[PDB]
């Protein structure tokens, strides 16, 4: 008897009116299946959102404890399990996702087996256990038949490109996704819809299409009750305002902190967003993480030092960063900081080069402004914006 079941019946005696609301809350205006769910041992809803919307409505503070207990005592061969895989991955509940995967690979239902097999590919790719090439070759060798995993096998590449600052292939790959081909799993279709809203928001951000970036994050927020998607929607809205609206950017990041109070990784992300915001506006910056040797945290230490004419301390930090391997978008920021510290236009040109290489049309505004401030010719600046990398 799942903790969700033990707790749901216990609480129904004290408050007996829940049937009418729970059936309204679970995508049934007519309460027949709830009775079935509530009493007979092992009978799932047709759609996974019925359990989800109930737990978030009656035990929101115990979502993880209950969903973990329910998900791991699930027949991996069922539709409910396949929905749960996407629930666990979307929420970044790796404890739930990884046990399901190894169970969906070993079982004898073929649909659940394909699901586990490409979610495994996504997990090894995002953990740098395999390369993009190894992932693409294994995806092709699966002979993916379901329109669920044909959508996901594209999504998992989109996540890989975003995290390694390789923005060039995103716009065309995401255009290949057609979620209308998913007709048997509505939860998966709706949570993939939110995934695409968030990925499209980032693609619009990287193209410096700032009004459309914010429209897509709005759709993402309107479309989900999943914290992870809300987190990155507010991060992306806030990032889109970095260069124009300090107060509104900060408000989105602070709203992010507010909903991340029980999650360290999400909390860290908004501190880094606010840290970058205050460096761009060259303000005193309480958000710097001095106990970190990641590229992102070291760069913001040096950025603040440079802002406040602490040039020796900044060269100390850029000396540590020199010994670290950067992706193309990270090297472009390294050169921008170098160029500020040395007032060296050649670094600002190397910065533009790697921003072009990663196809980041948003952050390139940083080296371009400095070149403007150094009196670079206006026609040259226009040429640098017009030209593209191969």
């Amino acid at each position: 008897m799942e903790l969700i079941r033990i707790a749901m019946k216990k609480d129904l005696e004290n408050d007996n009116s829940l049937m009418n609301k729970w059936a309204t809350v679970a995508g049934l205006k007519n309460p027949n299946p709830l009775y079935d769910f509530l009493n007979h041992d092992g009978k799932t809803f047709n759609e996974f959102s019925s359990i989800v919307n109930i737990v978030k409505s009656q035990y929101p503070d115990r979502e993880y404890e209950l969903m973990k207990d329910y998900c791991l005592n699930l027949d991996v061969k069922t539709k409910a399990a396949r929905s749960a895989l996407e629930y666990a991955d979307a929420n970044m509940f790796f404890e739930i996702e990884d046990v399901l995967i190894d169970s969906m690979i070993s079982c004898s239902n073929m649909k659940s087996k394909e699901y586990g097999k490409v979610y495994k590919i996504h997990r090894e790719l995002s953990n740098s256990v395999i390369t993009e090439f190894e992932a693409v070759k294994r995806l092709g060798k699966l002979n993916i038949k379901t329109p669920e995993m044909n959508s996901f096998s594209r999504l998992l590449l989109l996540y890989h490109y975003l995290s390694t600052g390789n923005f060039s292939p995103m716009a065309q790959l995401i255009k290949q996704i057609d979620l209308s081909e998913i007709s048997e799993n509505m939860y998966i279709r709706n949570t993939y819809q939110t995934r695409v809203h968030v990925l499209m928001s980032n693609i619009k951000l990287n193209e410096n299409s700032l009004e459309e970036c914010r429209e897509y994050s709005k759709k993402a927020l309107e479309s989900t009750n999943i914290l992870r998607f809300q987190v990155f929607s507010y991060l992306t809205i806030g990032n889109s305002l970095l260069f124009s609206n300090y107060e509104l950017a900060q408000e989105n990041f602070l709203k992010g902190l507010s909903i991340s109070v029980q999650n360290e990784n999400y909390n860290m992300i908004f501190q880094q967003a606010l840290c970058f915001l205050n460096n761009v506006w060259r303000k005193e910056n309480k958000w710097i993480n001095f106990e970190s040797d990641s590229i992102m945290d070291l760069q913001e230490q040096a950025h603040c030092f440079i802002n406040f004419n602490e040039n020796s301390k900044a060269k100390e930090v850029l000396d540590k960063l020199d010994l670290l391997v950067h992706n193309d978008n990270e090297l472009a920021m390294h050169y921008y900081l170098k160029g500020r510290l040395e007032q060296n236009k050649a670094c600002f040109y190397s910065s533009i080069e790697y921003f072009k290489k990663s196809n980041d049309k948003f952050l390139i505004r940083l080296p371009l402004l400095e070149l403007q401030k150094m009196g670079e010719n206006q026609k040259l600046l226009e040429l640098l914006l017009l030209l593209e990398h191969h």
Partner: peptide
């Protein structure tokens, strides 16, 4: 750097 995520 600037955090990004989806």
């Amino acid at each position: 750097g600037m955090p990004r995520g989806a």
